[PDB]
């Protein structure tokens, strides 16, 4: 689709069999979801945002369907204010910015 | 133009007689600029994201040119690690997400 930006670019994703809402976020290197259970191994990681740094759990090679488009890649889980889909999965679904 | 997301979508902006690089950020409601001594009245504000909140100065009706596309609106100035172009200006330059 083409998504304009007068509203937050919020979409439904499916991850670990569950539906969630997430913000399409070109300003994020990575995909960071609020606290949730994901299957498999994780490793501790630290990431930075506008307010400083946080600790996250890193899950690799997680399938995520985003607005009907398939991605499989890294998902970080920790205390983010909103679920964000970052460039690591945006690129997989063929997302560009156009103006 | 069309901006792919392999890399951070950094573009040249002009604000307050300065040329800067800034991140096109569909995840940001607001535009937040690195500390800079803009003239004009301002009002204090707090904005948050990953890592919590930073204190910023809100300036209204600031002309900002983004890749040659003119815009004018609110810019927040404070200790952000990076200049961020949020949806308030991205909508003025006609910016969309496409996949």
């Amino acid at each position: 689709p083409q998504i304009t930006l007068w509203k937050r670019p919020l979409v439904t994703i499916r991850i670990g069999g569950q539906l969630k809402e997430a913000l399409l976020d070109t300003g994020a290197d990575d995909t960071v979801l609020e606290e949730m259970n994901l299957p498999g191994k994780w490793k501790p990681k630290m990431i930075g945002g506008i307010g400083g740094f946080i600790k996250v759990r890193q899950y690799d090679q997680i399938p995520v369907e985003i607005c009907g488009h398939k991605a499989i890649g890294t998902v970080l889980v920790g205390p983010t204010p909103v679920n964000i889909i970052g460039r690591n999965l945006l690129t997989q679904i063929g997302c560009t910015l156009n103006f | 133009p069309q901006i792919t997301l392999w890399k951070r979508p950094l573009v040249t902006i002009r604000i307050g007689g300065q040329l800067k690089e800034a991140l096109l950020d569909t995840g940001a409601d607001d535009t937040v600029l690195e500390e800079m001594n803009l003239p004009g009245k301002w009002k204090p504000k707090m904005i948050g994201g990953i890592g919590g909140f930073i204190k910023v100065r809100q300036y209204d009706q600031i002309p900002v040119e983004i890749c040659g596309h003119k815009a004018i609106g609110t810019v927040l100035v404070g200790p952000t690690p990076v200049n961020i172009i949020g949806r308030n200006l991205l909508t003025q330059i006609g910016c969309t997400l496409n996949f």
Binding site: D30, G48, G86 | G27, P81, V82, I84
Partner: peptide
Amino acid sequence: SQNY
């Protein structure tokens, strides 16, 4: 790493 960096997420705005």
